[PDB]
Amino acid sequence: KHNMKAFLDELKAENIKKFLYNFTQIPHLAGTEQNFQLAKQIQSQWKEFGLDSVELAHYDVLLSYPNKTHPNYISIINEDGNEIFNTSLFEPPPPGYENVSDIVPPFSAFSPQGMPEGDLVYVNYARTEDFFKLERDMKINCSGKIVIARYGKVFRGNKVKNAQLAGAKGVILYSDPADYFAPGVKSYPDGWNLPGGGVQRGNILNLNGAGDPLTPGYPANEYAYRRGIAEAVGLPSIPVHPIGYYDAQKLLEKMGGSAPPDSSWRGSLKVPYNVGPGFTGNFSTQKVKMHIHSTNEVTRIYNVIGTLRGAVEPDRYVILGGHRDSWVFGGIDPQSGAAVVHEIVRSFGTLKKEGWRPRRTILFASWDAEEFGLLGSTEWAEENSRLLQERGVAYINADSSIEGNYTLRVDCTPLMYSLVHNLTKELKSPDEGFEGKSLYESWTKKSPSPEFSGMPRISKLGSGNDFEVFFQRLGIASGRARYTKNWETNKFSGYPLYHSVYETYELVEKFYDPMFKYHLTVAQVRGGMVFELANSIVQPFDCRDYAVVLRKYADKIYSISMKHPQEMKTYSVSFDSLFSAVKNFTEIASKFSERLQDFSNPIVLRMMNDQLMFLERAFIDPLGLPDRPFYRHVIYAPSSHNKYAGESFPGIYDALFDIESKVDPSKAWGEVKRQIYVAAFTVQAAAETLSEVA
Amino acid sequence: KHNMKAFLDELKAENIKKFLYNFTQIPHLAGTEQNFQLAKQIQSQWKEFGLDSVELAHYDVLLSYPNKTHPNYISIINEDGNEIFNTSLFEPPPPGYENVSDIVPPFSAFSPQGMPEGDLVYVNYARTEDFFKLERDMKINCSGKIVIARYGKVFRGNKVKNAQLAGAKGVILYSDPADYFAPGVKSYPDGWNLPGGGVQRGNILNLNGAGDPLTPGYPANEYAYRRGIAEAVGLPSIPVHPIGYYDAQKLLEKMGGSAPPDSSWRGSLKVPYNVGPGFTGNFSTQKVKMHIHSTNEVTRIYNVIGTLRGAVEPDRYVILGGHRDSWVFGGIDPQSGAAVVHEIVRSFGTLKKEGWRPRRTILFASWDAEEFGLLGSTEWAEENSRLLQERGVAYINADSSIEGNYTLRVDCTPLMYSLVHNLTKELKSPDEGFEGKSLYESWTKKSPSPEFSGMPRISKLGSGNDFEVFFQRLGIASGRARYTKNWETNKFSGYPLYHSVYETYELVEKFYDPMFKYHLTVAQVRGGMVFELANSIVQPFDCRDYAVVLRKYADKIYSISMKHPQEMKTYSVSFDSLFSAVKNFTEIASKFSERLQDFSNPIVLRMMNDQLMFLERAFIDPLGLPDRPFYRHVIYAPSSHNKYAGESFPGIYDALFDIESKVDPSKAWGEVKRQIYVAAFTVQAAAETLSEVA
C-alpha cells in the first residue's frame, strides 16, 4: 500500500545524518562557487531520487561581502588618533577547521562603507521602546553618536532602522552572555554556548518583503532594469558591525554618563551598563572608530526547483521549500532543514519509482540567498506569481529542523491547525519519558495552548524566512515546524551559536540530536503535512479555525483601542463593523463546513477545494499595507518593530501604536477608522468566498 | 432542442421596442427617486422572467447636481459689470415633453463652484497637442484665462485636466456644428442633428479607474471610511460648464488676438475662430463671467444583480452588464442597451422555465451611476473583487445598442475575436442589400480589417464605460458591440444628440431603427456571445489571436521609439526582450492550442478552461501603471490623453510620449527601459501560464 504510513516509514534518521554531514563540510555562502556546486549536487540527486524534472532557476541580485584585503574592525582611539584596542578580525575557528578557507569573517551584510569616530551610547536591545526610554524619559540624544546595542528580542534590521531614525552615525551589535550563554553549559566545543570570540553574522536590511533591493516587483532576470543604489530598497544609511562579548566588554567597560535606567538594561558582563554618551572622566577624550569596507555587488544565485507531477490535479501545487545558502558551515541553519528536505524527496521518490504519484503536484525548492534577505524565494515567486496565486495550495517551509531538543514548535495559518493536530496524533513522540505515546501528547504536555485545555500551542507566522513571499505577499496557506527548547527555563534568544562559525555538524551530532530522532520527527511532521496537502481528496483546511482566531484578534485590537476611551468618543471610533464581519465569517464558515461534509461529484469537490484554496488568498489586499506594498495580507504581517514576530490586524495595530504621541489626533484616529473599515471589509469579503457560489 | 438557435429565435424586435418605450418616458438620473423606482421594476421583471435570484446592491457615492434655485450660466459682462448676454438656463424641451418635470439642466458634473471673470482663450478641442500648439508654437499663455473648447475628439475630462494644467481659471465646453451637425440632415425633431439650443451633459472627472471619488479601492458601503473632499480622486479644480452653438456663437464672435493657426482649428460657425486672448478692440473691456453653483453630495445608488445559476460550473461567471441611469430620457444612452439586456434576460428565462440551465453561471447587471464615473459597476466590482478574479470568465458590456444604422462595431479582447467571427457568420444581416447574407459578410464588406483581407475590423477596448473595472483593473476578458455609422462619410463625433434632452424614444423609433432590426441584431450578438461563453464545453477563447496582436503592438511601440535613434544608441535602449517574449508567447500559445484540440477528462478540460480564463488575468500587474494604480493591465489602458481611446503597451507609450521635451533624457530613457522590462516580463509570464502545468 502506498499511503502516508509508507511514506513516513521510508524516512530514516541515518539518512538525515549522512546528508547533514555531506552539506556542512565547507561553507556555502550565497553567490560563491561552493554554493553553486552544492546546487548542482542537489539537482543531480533529486533527479536520481526520481523527481520528474529538476531545474536551476538563477537570478542576479544585490549581495554584500567584506573586502578580503581591507578588513572590517572597530577601535578605541586616543586623542592622538592612536588605535589602542582593536576588535577581532575573525572568530577563532573550531577544532579541526582551523585550515578551512573561505570562512567569511563576521560582518553585517549590506552595511555601507565608512570610518565614523565618536562617543558611544548604549541602547539596550535597540527596540522602539528602548529609544523611547532614552529620548523621552532619560533625555539622551543619539544624534551623531555611535550606538552599541545587544543582539536579541527583535530582528537586527529593526535595530539598525531604529538607530538611524534616532540619528546615530554607526551601530555596533554584540552578543551579551545574558542572551547567548545558558547558565551551567559550556562554550563550544565543549557545549552549545557562544564563546566570547563568537560573533553572529546577519543582514541588516529593511526590505518589507521586497526581495532583491534593486528589482522590487519583478524577477532579477537577464534583462531586468535595476534601480540605482540610491533608490534601492531597504539599505542602511550608517555603518554597522557585529562583535563578540570579549570585544564588547572592552568597549563597554569604560562607559560613563547616565546609569542604566533599571535592571532590564543590564546584561551579564562585569560592566555597569552605563548608557553614556561617552567614557568616564579618565577616558573622556578617547573615542570609538568603526572601519567598514564591505561592498554590495550584483551576484548570481541559484534555486533548485524539483517537480513531482500530480496524477489527478497537476495544476495544484503543494510546495516544500527551504534554503541552502549558509553564513559559514550551516550546521543548524539551514542544513539541518535541507537534510530533512533531501530525505523527504528521497522517500517521495521511492514511492514514485513503485508507480505512485500524489494527487496534486509537489514542488521542492532549495532556495539561495535566504541569508541576504529572502532573495532566492522572493525572486522565484515574483517570476512565477501568476502560477502561484491561481494554483498554489500551500507552502511548507524547511529551514533549521532544530533549535533545541525539548518539544515541537509549529507556526502556521489557522487553516492548518486541524491538519497539524491530526497528524501529530499519528506520529510517535521521540521524547524521553514519552515512549509509546503520540507526538501530540508530548507536545501538548510540554507546550500547552494558552487558550485551550488539552491542545498544544501553535503560533502565528512571523517573518525572517522564505515563506514571507508566499504567505504575506501572495496569500498562500503556509506553515513551518521544528524542534525547540523549553521556553520556560531558557531565557536566551534562538540558539546561542546562531550564525557563528561554531554552528557545525559536530554541534548537532554531539549536543543537539546524536540519534537524529528529533530530525526524523521533524521530517515526519513536514513531510506528513506535504503528503496530506498533496494527496487528500478534500484539502485538509478547516475554515472554522480561522473564524475562532479572527475573533481573538478582533478582541485584542479592540482592547488596545479601548485604552483611549475619550478619543474613541470624540472621533466616533467603532469596532462594530469588524465584529460584524467576524460574526458573519463564523456563520458562513460553519455552513460551508456542513456542505463540505455533506456534499461522487468532482466538480462540486473541486469547486469546494478551490473555495478552500482561495480562502487564504481572500485576505490579500492588492493595495498592500501603508508604505509596505509587499505586505498584502490584512490579518497577518511581520511586526513593524520586529520582523521576526507576527502582528494580527497590522494595519489597525500600527495606526494605534503610540497614537497618544501624534500631533494631530483627528488625523491619527481617522486613520484608525480607515484601517477598521479595511479590515472589516476584507474579513466580510473573505467570508463571502465561502458562501454558495450562485 | 435548447441550443443557441432556440435562444436567438426567442428574441423579438417588438419586445425590445416595448421595453425601450417603457424605459424612456421620464428621466432616470442617478441618485433620483425615478431611477430607484426603475431599479425595482427591473428587479421585479427579472424575477418574473425566471432568474434564480435578483437583488439590489446599493452604495453611497459622491454625485453632483445643479442647485435648483441658483442656476448655472455664463455671461458677457461690460466695464460696469452689467451682464449683457446670458447663456441659456435649459434646453428647449422637445415636442410633447415641454411639461415633463425633473429634466436636469445642462451642467458639467463635479464642477466646483465659482464665479470666475476673465478673458477668453479658444483652445480648439483642448487636446494635449492643442495646448502644445498654443504654448510652444503660438506663445499664448492660458494662465488666469477662461478657456473655451469645442467638444469632440477626446473625453471631456481630459480636456478639463489639460486646461487646468495650462493654468486656466475656468472652462466652457460647447458643441460645434462641425462635430455635431451632419450636412444635409435636419435638427431634432425633424432629423437626428443637434439644434443650436442643444447641449451635451457629462462628467468631467479624471478618476483613472478609481470609482467613487471618496472610497478608492473599497466599496462605498454602510461603514465605509470616506476621504475628505480635498483628498477625493479626480475632481476638477476650476469651474466648467457646457453650452450649445447658438450660445457659443455669441461668446466666440467677438474674439480677437491671434488668428487660428490653421483650418483644423476652424469649426463651422460664422466666426473667425480667433484664439484670443480676449475680444477685439471695440469690446476689449468686456469680459466673460461663469456662475457655477452645483454641489457634490453623497447619494445612494442601486445596481440590479440577476443570477442564472450554471448546471455544471456554477462557480464560473459570465457577466452581461450595462447601465440604467441616464442624463435625461436616455433614448439611446443607455436605454437602447438596457432594453436589449431586458429581452436577453427574458429569452434566457424562457429556456430556463422549460428546464434548461447554462453550463456556467450567468450574472446580469443593471448598473447605476455610470454617467457619474462608472460608479455602480466599479463599487460592485470592488466589493466582489475576490469572487470576480477567481471565477470571472468574461464580461460583455451593454450600453447604447446603436449610434448609427450602417454596420456593426465590436471592441474586445483578442481572446474573443474568433468567437465574434464565428457567431456573426451564423447571424442574418439586417442591412438593406444584404438580405439572405450573414452579418459577417455585411460587416466585413462595410468595415474591412486594416490588417487582413476578408475579415472585419475589431478594435481594442478603450474606456468611458462599465467594462473598465472588469478589464483594465481585474483582467477579465471583456467585449462590447453595437450598430454604428459609416465612419468614412461621417466626420461628426459619436451621435449628434448624445447626452442632450433630445435623446428620446422618438429619436430612435423615427430616425435610427424604426423596425428595431438593428437592436435585434445587437441583441443576437451580445446574447449569442453570452450564450457561447456560458455554455461551450471549452471556453471560446483563442490564445493565438493574442499572439498576433502582441506582435503588432510590439512593432508599433518599437517604431515610436525608433524616431529617436541617437538616444536609443546613447542609452542602450533595446526592445529585444519584448520581441523575445512575444515570440515565446506565440510558440507556447501554438502548442497549447494543439493540446486543447487533442486532449473524456473533465479535469484536463477544466485545467485547460482555467488556463484559458486566467490568460487575460495574467496581463495584470498588481503594482498598476505609473500613478494610475487601478489601470493594471500591461497590454491595454485608456489613453492618458483621451479616456475613450485604448492604448497598447501604455506604460512604454507614456514613457516615450513627448520624450524629446524632457529635461533629463537619461532619466526619461531609463524609464522607457524600465517599462520595456515590465512589458517583456509580463508577456513572458502570461505565456508561461499556457505551458504544461507540471
Ligand SMILES: O=C(O)CC[C@H](NC(=O)N[C@@H](CCCCn1cc(COCCOCCOCCOCCNc2ccc(N(O)O)cc2N(O)O)nn1)C(=O)O)C(=O)O
Ligand atoms: O532577511 C530576512 O528576513 C531573514 C534572514 C535570516 N533568517 C533567519 O536567520 N531566520 C532564522 C531566525 C532565527 C531568529 C532567532 N531570534 C529571534 C529573536 C528574537 O525574537 C523575535 C520575536 O520572535 C517572534 C516570536 O514571538 C513569540 C512566538 O512564539 C513562537 C514560539 N512559541 C512559544 C511561545 C511561548 C512559549 N512559552 O514561553 O511557553 C513557548 C513557545 N514554544 O514554541 O514552545 N532573536 N533571534 C529562522 O530560523 O527563521 C536572518 O534572520 O538573518
Ligand SMILES: O=C(O)CC[C@H](NC(=O)N[C@@H](CCCCn1cc(COCCOCCOCCOCCNc2ccc(N(O)O)cc2N(O)O)nn1)C(=O)O)C(=O)O
Ligand atoms: O466617466 C466615464 O468614464 C464615462 C461616463 C460616460 N460614458 C459614456 O457616455 N460613454 C459613451 C461614450 C460615447 C463617446 C462618444 N465620443 C467619442 C468621442 C471621441 O472619440 C475618442 C476616441 O474614440 C476611441 C476610438 O478610437 C478609434 C477606434 O475605432 C472604434 C470604431 N472603429 C472604427 C474605426 C475606423 C473606421 N473607419 O474610419 O473605417 C471605422 C470603425 N468602425 O467602427 O466602423 N467623442 N465623443 C459610450 O457609448 O461608451 C461619459 O463619457 O460621459
Ligand SMILES: *[C@@H]1O[C@H](CO)[C@@H](O[C@@H]2O[C@H](CO)[C@@H](O[C@@H]3O[C@H](CO)[C@@H](O)[C@H](O[C@H]4O[C@H](CO)[C@@H](O)[C@H](O)[C@@H]4O)[C@@H]3O)[C@H](O)[C@H]2NC(C)=O)[C@H](O)[C@H]1NC(C)=O
Ligand atoms: C454581516 O452580514 C449581515 C447580513 O446578515 C449584513 O447585514 C447587512 O447590513 C447592512 C448594514 O451595514 C444592511 O444595510 C441596510 O440595507 C437597507 C436595505 O436593505 C437600507 O435601507 C439601510 O440603510 C438605511 O439605514 C441606515 C442605518 O440607519 C442609514 O445610514 C441609511 O441612510 C438608510 O436609512 C442599510 O443600508 C443590509 O440590509 C444588511 N443585509 C442583510 C440583512 O441581508 C452585514 O453588513 C454584514 N457585516 C459586514 C461587516 O459586512
Ligand SMILES: *[C@@H]1O[C@H](CO)[C@@H](O[C@@H]2O[C@H](CO)[C@@H](O[C@@H]3O[C@H](CO)[C@@H](O)[C@H](O[C@H]4O[C@H](CO)[C@@H](O)[C@H](O)[C@@H]4O)[C@@H]3O)[C@H](O)[C@H]2NC(C)=O)[C@H](O)[C@H]1NC(C)=O
Ligand atoms: C524566451 O524563451 C527562451 C527559452 O526558449 C528564453 O531563453 C532563456 O534566455 C535566457 C537569457 O535571457 C538564458 O539565460 C542564460 O542562461 C544560462 C544558463 O542556462 C546562463 O549561463 C547565461 O548567462 C551568461 O550569459 C549572459 C549573456 O551573455 C551573461 O550576462 C551572464 O553573465 C552569463 O555569462 C544566461 O543567463 C536562458 O538559458 C534561456 N533559457 C532556455 C534557453 O531554456 C528567453 O529568456 C525567453 N524570453 C523572455 C523575454 O523571457
Ligand SMILES: *[C@@H]1O[C@H](CO)[C@@H](O[C@@H]2O[C@H](CO)[C@@H](O)[C@H](O)[C@H]2NC(C)=O)[C@H](O)[C@H]1NC(C)=O
Ligand atoms: C556529498 O555527497 C555527494 C554525492 O555522493 C558527493 O558527490 C559525489 O562525489 C563523488 C566522488 O567525488 C563523485 O564521483 C560523484 O560524481 C559526486 N556526485 C554528485 C556531485 O552528485 C560529494 O563528494 C559529497 N561531499 C562531501 C563533502 O562529502
Ligand SMILES: *[C@@H]1O[C@H](CO)[C@@H](O[C@@H]2O[C@H](CO)[C@@H](O)[C@H](O)[C@H]2NC(C)=O)[C@H](O)[C@H]1NC(C)=O
Ligand atoms: C589596531 O590596528 C591598527 C591598524 O592596523 C594599528 O594601527 C597601525 O599600526 C601600524 C604599525 O604600528 C602603523 O604603521 C599604521 O599606520 C597604523 N594604522 C592606524 C590606522 O592607526 C594599531 O596598532 C592596532 N592597535 C592595537 C592595539 O593593536
Ligand SMILES: *[C@@H]1O[C@H](CO)[C@@H](O[C@@H]2O[C@H](CO)[C@@H](O)[C@H](O)[C@H]2NC(C)=O)[C@H](O)[C@H]1NC(C)=O
Ligand atoms: C481531523 O480529524 C477529525 C477526526 O477524524 C476530522 O473530523 C471528522 O471528519 C469526518 C469526515 O468529515 C466527520 O465525519 C467527523 O464528524 C469529524 N469529526 C469531528 C469534527 O469531530 C477532521 O476533519 C480532521 N481534520 C482535517 C483532516 O483537516
Ligand SMILES: *[C@@H]1O[C@H](CO)[C@@H](O[C@@H]2O[C@H](CO)[C@@H](O)[C@H](O)[C@H]2NC(C)=O)[C@H](O)[C@H]1NC(C)=O
Ligand atoms: C413600464 O412597465 C412596467 C411593467 O409593466 C409598468 O409597471 C407596472 O404598472 C402597472 C400599472 O401601474 C402595475 O399594476 C404593476 O405593478 C407595475 N409592475 C411593475 C412595476 O413591475 C410601468 O407602468 C411601465 N411604465 C411606463 C412609463 O409605461
Ligand SMILES: *[C@@H]1O[C@H](CO)[C@@H](O[C@@H]2O[C@H](CO)[C@@H](O)[C@H](O)[C@H]2NC(C)=O)[C@H](O)[C@H]1NC(C)=O
Ligand atoms: C443676465 O442675467 C442676470 C442675472 O439674472 C441679469 O442681471 C440682473 O438683473 C436684475 C434686474 O435688472 C438685477 O436686479 C440684478 O441685480 C442683476 N444681477 C446681476 C448679477 O447682474 C441680467 O440682466 C441678464 N442679462 C441679460 C442680457 O438678460
Ligand SMILES: *[C@@H]1O[C@H](CO)[C@@H](O[C@@H]2O[C@H](CO)[C@@H](O)[C@H](O)[C@H]2NC(C)=O)[C@H](O)[C@H]1NC(C)=O
Ligand atoms: C471558430 O470556428 C472554427 C471553424 O469551425 C473553429 O476552428 C475549428 O475547430 C475545430 C474543433 O476544435 C477543429 O477541429 C478545426 O480544425 C478548427 N478549424 C480551423 C481552425 O480552421 C474555431 O475553434 C471556432 N472558434 C471558437 C469556437 O472560438
Ligand SMILES: *[C@@H]1O[C@H](CO)[C@@H](O)[C@H](O)[C@H]1NC(C)=O
Ligand atoms: C578592497 O581593498 C583593496 C585594498 O585596500 C582595494 O585595492 C580594493 O579596491 C577593494 N576592493 C573592493 C571590491 O572594493
Ligand SMILES: *[C@@H]1O[C@H](CO)[C@@H](O)[C@H](O)[C@H]1NC(C)=O
Ligand atoms: C540632538 O542633537 C543635534 C545637535 O548636534 C540636534 O540637531 C538635535 O535637534 C538634537 N535633538 C534633541 C536635543 O532633541
Ligand SMILES: *[C@@H]1O[C@H](CO)[C@@H](O)[C@H](O)[C@H]1NC(C)=O
Ligand atoms: C538536550 O536535552 C537535555 C535534557 O533536558 C538538556 O539538558 C540539554 O541541554 C539539551 N541539549 C540542547 C542543545 O538543548
Ligand SMILES: *[C@@H]1O[C@H](CO)[C@@H](O)[C@H](O)[C@H]1NC(C)=O
Ligand atoms: C442653492 O441655492 C439656494 C438659493 O440661493 C441656497 O439657499 C441653497 O443653500 C443652495 N443649495 C445648496 C444645496 O447649496
Ligand SMILES: *[C@@H]1O[C@H](CO)[C@@H](O)[C@H](O)[C@H]1NC(C)=O
Ligand atoms: C503665464 O502667466 C503668468 C502671469 O500672470 C505667469 O505666472 C506664468 O509664468 C506665465 N507663463 C509663461 C509666459 O510662459
Ligand SMILES: *[C@@H]1O[C@H](CO)[C@@H](O)[C@H](O)[C@H]1NC(C)=O
Ligand atoms: C439610416 O440609414 C440611411 C441610409 O444610409 C441614412 O441616410 C440615415 O442617415 C440613417 N439614419 C441615421 C440616424 O444614421
